[PDB]
């Protein structure tokens, strides 16, 4: 079925409880793996690319029409 | 009052109980906006400003942390003062949640 969603939630939660600001880089890219974003990014080893992808996606997603 | 050293210390001690207790769950140090409110469409003025904001992933010290705070600012996700050393991580979590439940709906 599809609360692979409920999986990604708990995993993302567990990742979050273990990270502080010093782990920004690592936190982005393993969130990027949890959300299956990491494969759609050209530069999978830059953290800013991964986050740039999620941001633009979310910007589109909130567009009217 | 007390040092922000002492303050973070206090927060870590409280978090240490709650986090390790339920590892499947995140509890924000300060309140964060409801996810479904963050899912509202752009008000048209903002949408129109955004057509022209080009993503400056490359800005020489738009370092990772600066970039993160811009992205949150764009999405109305607050970055709180506390915890002084894990606030960006809490904000990013809200961002990734938002992303997650969008992808969820898109997949019908």
Coordinates of C-alpha atoms in Angstrom, one line a residue:
Chain A
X1 CA 0.0 0.0 0.0
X2 CA 1.2 3.7 0.5
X3 CA 1.9 4.8 4.0
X4 CA 5.4 4.2 3.0
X5 CA 4.3 7.7 3.9
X6 CA 4.0 6.6 7.6
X7 CA 7.4 5.1 7.2
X8 CA 9.1 8.2 5.8
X9 CA 7.4 10.2 8.6
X10 CA 8.8 8.1 11.4
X11 CA 12.2 7.8 9.7
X12 CA 12.3 11.6 9.1
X13 CA 11.3 12.1 12.7
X14 CA 14.1 9.9 14.0
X15 CA 16.6 11.6 11.8
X16 CA 15.5 14.9 13.2
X17 CA 15.8 14.0 16.8
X18 CA 19.5 13.2 16.2
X19 CA 20.6 16.3 14.3
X20 CA 21.6 19.8 15.3
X21 CA 22.7 22.8 13.2
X22 CA 26.2 21.3 12.7
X23 CA 24.6 18.4 10.8
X24 CA 22.8 20.6 8.3
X25 CA 24.6 19.1 5.3
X26 CA 23.9 15.5 6.4
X27 CA 20.4 16.2 7.5
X28 CA 19.4 17.6 4.1
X29 CA 20.7 14.7 2.0
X30 CA 19.4 11.9 4.2
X31 CA 16.1 13.7 4.2
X32 CA 16.6 13.8 0.5
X33 CA 16.9 10.0 0.4
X34 CA 13.9 9.4 2.7
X35 CA 11.8 11.5 0.3
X36 CA 13.2 10.0 -2.9
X37 CA 14.4 13.5 -4.0
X38 CA 18.1 12.6 -4.1
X39 CA 17.6 10.8 -7.5
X40 CA 16.0 13.7 -9.3
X41 CA 18.8 16.1 -8.5
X42 CA 21.7 16.6 -10.9
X43 CA 24.2 17.3 -8.1
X44 CA 23.3 14.7 -5.4
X45 CA 26.4 15.6 -3.3
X46 CA 25.6 19.3 -2.9
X47 CA 23.2 20.0 -0.1
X48 CA 22.0 23.3 -1.6
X49 CA 20.9 21.5 -4.7
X50 CA 18.8 19.0 -2.8
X51 CA 17.1 21.8 -0.8
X52 CA 16.8 24.0 -3.9
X53 CA 14.8 21.1 -5.5
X54 CA 12.4 20.7 -2.6
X55 CA 11.9 24.5 -2.5
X56 CA 10.9 24.9 -6.1
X57 CA 8.7 21.9 -5.9
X58 CA 6.9 23.4 -2.9
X59 CA 6.7 26.7 -4.7
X60 CA 5.0 25.2 -7.7
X61 CA 2.7 23.0 -5.4
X62 CA 1.2 26.1 -3.8
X63 CA 0.5 27.9 -7.1
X64 CA -3.1 28.7 -7.9
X65 CA -4.2 27.3 -11.3
Chain B
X1 CA 18.5 35.2 33.6
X2 CA 21.2 32.8 32.4
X3 CA 23.7 32.2 29.6
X4 CA 22.5 30.8 26.3
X5 CA 25.0 28.0 27.3
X6 CA 22.8 27.3 30.3
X7 CA 19.7 27.6 28.3
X8 CA 20.7 25.1 25.6
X9 CA 21.8 22.8 28.5
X10 CA 18.3 22.9 30.0
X11 CA 16.7 22.2 26.6
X12 CA 19.0 19.3 25.9
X13 CA 18.1 17.8 29.3
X14 CA 14.4 18.1 28.7
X15 CA 14.7 16.9 25.1
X16 CA 16.8 13.9 26.1
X17 CA 13.8 12.4 28.0
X18 CA 11.2 13.1 25.3
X19 CA 13.2 12.4 22.2
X20 CA 14.6 9.0 23.3
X21 CA 11.2 8.2 24.8
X22 CA 9.3 8.4 21.5
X23 CA 12.0 8.2 18.6
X24 CA 9.2 8.1 16.1
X25 CA 8.0 11.6 16.8
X26 CA 9.2 15.2 16.7
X27 CA 8.1 17.8 19.2
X28 CA 8.9 21.4 18.3
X29 CA 10.6 23.5 21.0
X30 CA 8.3 26.4 20.0
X31 CA 5.0 26.1 18.1
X32 CA 5.1 25.7 14.4
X33 CA 2.3 26.4 11.9
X34 CA -0.2 23.7 11.0
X35 CA 0.8 21.8 7.9
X36 CA -2.5 22.3 6.1
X37 CA -2.2 26.1 6.5
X38 CA 1.2 25.9 4.9
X39 CA -0.6 24.2 2.0
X40 CA -2.8 27.2 1.1
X41 CA -2.1 28.5 -2.4
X42 CA 0.0 31.6 -2.9
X43 CA -1.9 34.9 -2.5
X44 CA -1.6 36.3 -6.0
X45 CA 0.7 39.2 -5.1
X46 CA 3.2 36.9 -3.5
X47 CA 2.9 34.4 -6.4
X48 CA 3.6 37.2 -8.7
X49 CA 6.7 38.3 -6.8
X50 CA 7.9 34.7 -6.9
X51 CA 7.8 34.5 -10.7
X52 CA 10.8 36.8 -10.6
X53 CA 12.7 35.6 -7.6
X54 CA 15.4 33.5 -9.1
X55 CA 16.8 30.8 -6.7
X56 CA 20.2 32.1 -5.5
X57 CA 21.6 28.7 -4.5
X58 CA 24.9 30.1 -5.8
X59 CA 25.3 33.2 -3.7
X60 CA 28.9 33.1 -2.5
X61 CA 28.0 33.0 1.3
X62 CA 24.4 32.2 1.0
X63 CA 26.0 29.4 2.9
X64 CA 23.9 26.3 3.6
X65 CA 22.4 27.9 6.7
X66 CA 21.5 31.2 5.1
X67 CA 19.9 29.4 2.2
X68 CA 17.8 27.2 4.6
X69 CA 16.5 30.3 6.4
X70 CA 15.5 32.0 3.1
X71 CA 13.6 28.9 2.0
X72 CA 11.8 28.8 5.3
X73 CA 11.1 32.6 5.0
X74 CA 9.6 32.0 1.6
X75 CA 7.3 29.4 3.0
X76 CA 6.3 31.2 6.2
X77 CA 8.0 28.6 8.4
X78 CA 9.5 30.5 11.4
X79 CA 13.0 30.0 12.5
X80 CA 12.9 30.3 16.3
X81 CA 15.6 31.6 18.5
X82 CA 15.5 28.3 20.5
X83 CA 17.1 25.9 20.5
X84 CA 20.1 28.1 19.6
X85 CA 21.9 25.1 18.1
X86 CA 19.1 23.1 16.6
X87 CA 16.5 25.7 15.4
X88 CA 17.3 25.3 11.7
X89 CA 16.8 21.5 12.0
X90 CA 13.3 22.0 13.5
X91 CA 12.4 24.4 10.7
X92 CA 13.7 22.1 8.0
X93 CA 11.6 19.4 9.5
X94 CA 8.5 21.4 8.9
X95 CA 9.6 22.0 5.4
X96 CA 10.2 18.3 4.7
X97 CA 6.9 17.4 6.3
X98 CA 5.1 20.0 4.1
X99 CA 6.9 18.4 1.1
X100 CA 5.9 15.0 2.2
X101 CA 2.2 15.5 2.5
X102 CA 2.1 17.3 -0.8
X103 CA 3.7 14.3 -2.5
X104 CA 1.2 12.2 -0.7
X105 CA -1.8 14.1 -2.2
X106 CA -0.3 14.2 -5.7
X107 CA -0.1 10.4 -5.6
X108 CA -4.0 10.5 -5.2

